[PDB]
């Protein structure tokens, strides 16, 4: 177990409010490499369950504020999804850093670092809010499992074990040494990717024309069905119209996450 | 008996032959094929994931003097600076001005998540070319699957059927493949340590759980500030996160001849290339002579309406005074026109309609029922639609007019 | 395959907020296709259904005898799952179980449970 | 809803068959073409495993020692030949109308 | 009547601080058309007088809220400024989605939605934010009077009156139906638009020389006053030096919020 046998440390962040400090709530590590917009970071404070809080060190008293007082910020803010050890789980848009505070019974107490937040959208619409309702595809989310799946780090004994960090020193007693599990790994799924409008599709000889009207940024991938394949693609956010020449043998055509649709000529 | 026919190798088309002796009665052979594979030996070489730059702890003597202890972590780096961490009220709260030693230790790890976000390289070489057919020599009904290798056959009741080989040598699986999220990749993907910062290779693992990785990721310890203990370190982009944002598309969109890339079984289904060819050895028992079918009738057929369309266009009508009313084979010998079926029904003494397609303007095909030579001719109207979706039932010879 | 285990007091006083918790031990309780139940039998009545909940889209069934005082809830974070029983009295004492339920790409899910946890004991006495 | 079994108990010496029979207030058919019925098997000291749901259909787990039928609300399960390790209750169960209530417990040991 | 027999509803975010759940909060309609950054928001919660509040609906419950706990957030924080039935209107600047939230006794509830708020500055010099003073021109802004207008939305008893809703069904025993007035409508008036900087003219031989020198984008309008009238429109933001030719039969020109002004060669 983790919240009953560990201890958060204070750690050096740029910028604690006021220049620089030893900050309860130091980032060692962000990740935002996965598709929606899950971030998963490595604090300087836990998560346990005395129902879901967060436990800081201040001058070696351990304190304890609730998870629904934190707030953390990348250029929007945040949604915290939860919270296990060091680590925790949200969802956040895309920005230049990221940024954590909470405010005790006096001036309130923050930690900002530059760590590229990421949005990486799912299929052939480039989005930067995720939609209603649309088709379903393949997805590796920074997961809700708190479960050991293989990953670990490791940390030591200097009465409690803490984080093999960065920014503290290596005794030189015994490196009693251990290992303890990343919660919030990157599981797969089905997420819900947006269906661009349907193409206009006006016919000629020999020739398909395709006035196309996005509501975003859509990929377009046009090839042959032939020995030379003469494969078109590129991405579309203005309305267009774009005409493709479609022999007897064949004609491929994707818009977005729609399904490949075929065409092919006759005399 | 012994047949060698050759089939266009694509899917969802029929295609409807006949064995005919010079004295027994015809036999029908529809063969259908619903797959056609294309299946490379895939030989393992590496994988890849992000890289985290795991960094061992300072190691601090305050008016001391360290040395490194040489370990072996993938690019491990490890460096001794002099003076940073100078006096109390400057971090690491030691008594000095210099003379004051730090150790910094930085080595590359393979992500926490490389288990679940990893790209696979791949050589690929000799395709193992392979099919799902739906057969019927005879009245009967198969839904084998057929290696088109000319040494592997199957056998239903009596007969004895072989495919392939040389379907046009062909293959679009380049020799370096790289495989990632179901997408399938032509990269010329660099050796087991070879790999540089910066590109697709930076970190290599054998496999994904192996022991041992190789790290070339252009890592420089750099020198602390004064205020708080801390490790720091210039380290390049992944090459992993720079494939991924200027990688071209898939293999199943850059892909030659209409193929449909798929996933760990790599494969190129219903690739429109090249012709299967097909050897048989019918029995005599499926192979029965003229005593129980119909024969020779005084047939005369008339084209009523063609179109020389992709499609089942024409329609012929035969007007025959036959013995029995039973079945008969059907078939074209010519590329001049394609038909639906093999069976057509006669009546005692009735007519017959027979959906075809054809691709010229003026058909003279030489038409066939159970053993006559029935001849149509006639004119075709042009078609109704210039685009389509239903591909192509016929031969195309430069037969226009 | 996937064990189950129950948890909880026993001797909770009358005319109080009850409570048990129930683990997926090797399982996934974040899964569709999955609902999770909780069942008591007392002496002499014969089982008895209470209540369950979706693991995916988690929105509760209770029975409407006791729909004014029970409540069943969740944890993705500890892969727990919990029961609230308000207001007690005499006759409660009885055995809890909690279930999971098969596959459920059927309507025959319903009311088909399997692979349960042994039990916990709840004596409503002083 | 209410639900009623019979026999309370059912003695029996080995080797034969045995008839069990379930008496439903509402018709259990659905408009879809389904009888929900399920039969647990109650051994002493564990928690109750099943051999015969849909009215009519085993389980996976099961010996073919069993079967079961019905119409609408009157159910019969059904035994082929009972051995020793079949003591223990049987319960009738219900489904498709809340609350999934659950039978009274017929008692069957040798 | 006005209104004392309406009732909230329950629906479909897509965002509600933990993945998707039901929201008292939904966001049924978001329209951004107007000029000078107000939108117009239609929710699944009502806005009366018993004075600013929010009644919300909850599990069968209603609820209630004032209206300074409310928060709603584009890319910036935004503003509102009024709340009349299920709409709300406010002064939000430019993003790709609109969240809003509060927050009861320890809860926060949320919804997101993607649509796209967008300012669109009045005039000639294309802005963000508008200007502490300049010229007055004419803009339709989604107006603060709630009278009926014309404009009518529709809702229905299943006790009480809901909207015909999207993310609510239809009963089955009697479609009692009726229409109730959208405020806020898109109204006309006058709003205050940047004026830039003064051009620098210099002269030439049937030539004239323009320094400009912006704080901002800004169309540049030519034309000759002939009958080829060759006319230049530009979008100029860096210091730039344009020279144009000037003939007998004219040349004007507009740079911004300017009036135009007509310039006359001789010889």
């Known amino acids: 177990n983790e919240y009953k046998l560990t201890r958060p440390y204070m750690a050096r962040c740029i910028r604690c409010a006021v220049g620089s400090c030893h900050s309860p709530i130091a980032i060692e590590a962000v990740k935002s490499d996965g598709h929606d917009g899950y971030v998963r970071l490595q604090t300087s404070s836990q998560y346990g369950l005395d129902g879901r809080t967060m436990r800081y060190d201040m001058h070696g008293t351990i304190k304890e504020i609730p998870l629904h007082q934190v707030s953390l910020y990348t250029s929007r803010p945040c949604h915290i999804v939860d919270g296990h050890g060091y680590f925790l789980l949200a969802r956040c848009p895309a920005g230049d850093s990221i940024t954590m505070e909470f405010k005790k019974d006096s001036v309130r107490h923050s930690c900002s670092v530059p760590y590229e937040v990421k949005f990486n959208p799912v299929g052939r619409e480039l989005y930067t809010h995720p939609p209603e309702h649309g088709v379903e595809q393949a997805c590796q989310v920074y997961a809700h499992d708190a479960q050991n799946r293989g990953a670990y780090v490791e940390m030591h004994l200097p009465d409690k074990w803490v984080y093999n960090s960065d920014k503290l020193p290596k005794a030189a007693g015994a490196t009693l040494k251990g290992k303890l599990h990343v919660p919030f790994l990157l599981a797969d799924g089905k997420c819900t990717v947006p269906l661009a409008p349907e193409p206009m599709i006006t016919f000629g000889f020999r020739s398909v024309s395709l006035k196309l009207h996005p509501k975003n940024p859509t990929y377009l991938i046009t090839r042959q069905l032939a020995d030379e394949p003469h494969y078109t693609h590129e991405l579309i956010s203005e309305p267009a119209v774009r005409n493709f020449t479609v022999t007897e043998k064949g004609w491929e055509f994707v818009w977005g996450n729609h399904p490949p649709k075929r065409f092919w000529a006759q005399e | 008996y012994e047949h060698a026919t050759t089939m266009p190798s694509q899917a969802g088309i029929s295609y409807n032959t006949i064995v005919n002796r010079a004295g027994y009665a015809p036999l029908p052979i529809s063969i259908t094929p619903t797959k056609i594979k294309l299946i490379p030996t895939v030989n393992l070489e590496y994988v890849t994931c992000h890289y985290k730059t795991g960094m061992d702890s300072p190691a601090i003597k305050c008016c001391g003097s360290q040395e490194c202890t040489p370990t072996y972590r993938p690019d491990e780096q490890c460096k001794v600076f002099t003076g940073v961490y100078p006096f109390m009220w400057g971090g690491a709260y030691c008594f000095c001005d210099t003379e004051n030693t730090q150790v910094s230790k930085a080595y590359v790890m393979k992500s926490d998540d490389c288990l679940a976000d990893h790209a696979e390289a791949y050589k690929a070489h000799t395709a193992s070319v392979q099919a799902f057919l739906n057969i019927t020599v005879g009245e009967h009904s198969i839904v084998t699957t057929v290696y088109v290798n000319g040494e592997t056959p199957v056998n239903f009741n009596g007969v004895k059927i072989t495919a392939g080989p040389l379907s046009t040598a062909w293959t679009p699986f380049d020799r370096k493949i790289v495989q990632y999220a179901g997408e399938i990749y032509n990269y010329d993907f660099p050796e087991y340590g070879a790999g540089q910062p910066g590109a697709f290779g930076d970190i290599q693992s054998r496999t994904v759980s192996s022991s041992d990785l190789y790290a070339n990721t252009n890592l420089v310890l750099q020198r602390p500030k004064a205020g708080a203990i801390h490790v720091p370190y210039t380290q390049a982009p992944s090459g992993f996160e720079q494939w991924k944002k200027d990688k071209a598309p898939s293999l199943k969109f850059t892909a030659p001849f209409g193929c449909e890339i798929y996933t760990n079984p790599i494969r190129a289904e219903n690739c429109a290339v090249g012709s299967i060819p097909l050897a048989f050895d019918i029995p005599d028992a499926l192979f029965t002579r003229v005593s129980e079918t119909p024969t020779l009738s005084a047939a005369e057929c008339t084209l009523n309406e063609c179109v020389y369309s992709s499609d089942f266009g024409g329609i012929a009508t035969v007007k025959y005074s036959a013995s029995k009313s039973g079945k008969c084979a059907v078939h074209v010998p010519s590329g001049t026109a394609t038909l639906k079926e093999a069976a057509v029904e006669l009546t005692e003494q009735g007519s017959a309609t027979i959906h075809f397609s054809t691709a010229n303007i003026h058909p003279e095909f030489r038409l066939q029922i159970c053993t006559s030579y029935v001849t149509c001719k006639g004119d075709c109207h042009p078609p109704k639609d210039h685009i389509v979706t239903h591909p192509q039932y016929h031969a195309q010879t430069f037969t226009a007019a | 395959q996937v064990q189950v285990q129950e948890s909880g007091p026993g001797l909770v006083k009358p005319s109080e907020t009850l409570s048990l918790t129930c683990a997926v031990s090797?399982?996934?309780?974040?899964?569709?296709?999955?609902?999770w139940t909780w069942i008591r039998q007392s002496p002499g009545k014969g089982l008895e259904w209470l209540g369950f909940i979706h693991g995916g889209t988690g929105k509760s069934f209770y029975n409407p005898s006791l729909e004014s005082r029970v409540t069943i809830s969740k944890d993705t974070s500890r892969n727990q799952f919990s029961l609230t029983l308000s207001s007690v009295s005499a006759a409660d004492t009885a055995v809890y179980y909690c279930?999971?339920?098969?596959?459920?790409?059927?309507?025959?899910?319903?009311?088909?449970?399997?692979?349960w946890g042994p039990g916990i004991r709840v004596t409503v006495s002083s | 809803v209410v639900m009623t079994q019979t026999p309370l108990s059912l003695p029996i010496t080995p080797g034969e068959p045995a008839s069990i029979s379930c008496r439903s207030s509402?018709?259990?058919?659905?408009?879809?073409?389904?009888?929900?019925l399920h039969w647990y098997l109650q051994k002493p000291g564990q928690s109750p495993q099943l051999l015969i749901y849909g009215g009519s259909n085993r389980a996976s787990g099961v010996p073919d020692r069993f079967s079961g039928s019905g119409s609408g609300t009157d159910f019969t399960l059904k035994i082929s030949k009972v051995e020793a390790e079949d003591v223990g209750v049987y319960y009738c169960?219900?489904?498709?109308?809340?609350?999934?209530?659950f039978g009274q417990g017929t008692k069957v040991e040798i | 009547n006005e209104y004392k027999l309406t009732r909230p509803y329950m629906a479909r975010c897509i965002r509600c601080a933990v993945g998707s759940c039901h929201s008292p909060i939904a966001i049924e309609a978001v329209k951004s058309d107007g000029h000078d950054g107000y939108v117009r928001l239609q929710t699944s919660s009502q806005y009366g007088l018993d004075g600013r509040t929010m009644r919300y609906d909850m599990h069968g419950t209603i609820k209630e809220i004032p209206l300074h706990q409310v928060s709603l957030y584009t890319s910036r924080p935004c503003h509102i400024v009024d709340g009349h039935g299920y709409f709300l209107l406010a002064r939000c600047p430019a993003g790709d989605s609109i969240t809003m939230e509060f927050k009861k006794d320890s809860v926060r509830h949320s919804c997101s939605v993607p649509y796209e708020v967008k300012f669109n500055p009045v005039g000639r010099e294309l802005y963000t934010h508008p200007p502490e003073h300049g010229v007055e021109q004419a803009c339709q802004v989604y107006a603060h009077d709630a009278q009926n207008r014309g404009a009518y939305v529709e809702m229905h008893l299943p006790d009480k009156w809901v909207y015909n809703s999207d993310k609510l069904p239809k009963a089955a025993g009697a479609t009692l139906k009726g229409k109730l007035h959208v405020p806020f409508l898109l109204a006309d008036g006058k709003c205050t638009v940047p004026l830039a900087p003064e051009p620098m003219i210099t002269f030439g031989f049937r030539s004239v020389s323009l320094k400009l020198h912006p704080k901002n984008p800004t169309y540049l309008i030519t034309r000759q006053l002939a009958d080829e009238p060759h006319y230049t429109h530009e979008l100029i933001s860096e210091p730039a030096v344009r020279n144009f030719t000037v003939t007998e039969k004219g040349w004007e020109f507009v740079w911004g919020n300017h009036p135009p002004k007509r310039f006359w060669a001789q010889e």
């Open positions: 279930a999971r339920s098969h596959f459920c790409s059927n309507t025959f899910c319903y009311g088909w449970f399997d692979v």
């Open positions: 090797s399982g996934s309780i974040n899964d569709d296709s999955y609902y």
């Open positions: 169960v219900q489904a498709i109308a809340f609350p999934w209530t």
């Open positions: 509402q018709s259990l058919l659905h408009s879809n073409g389904n009888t929900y």
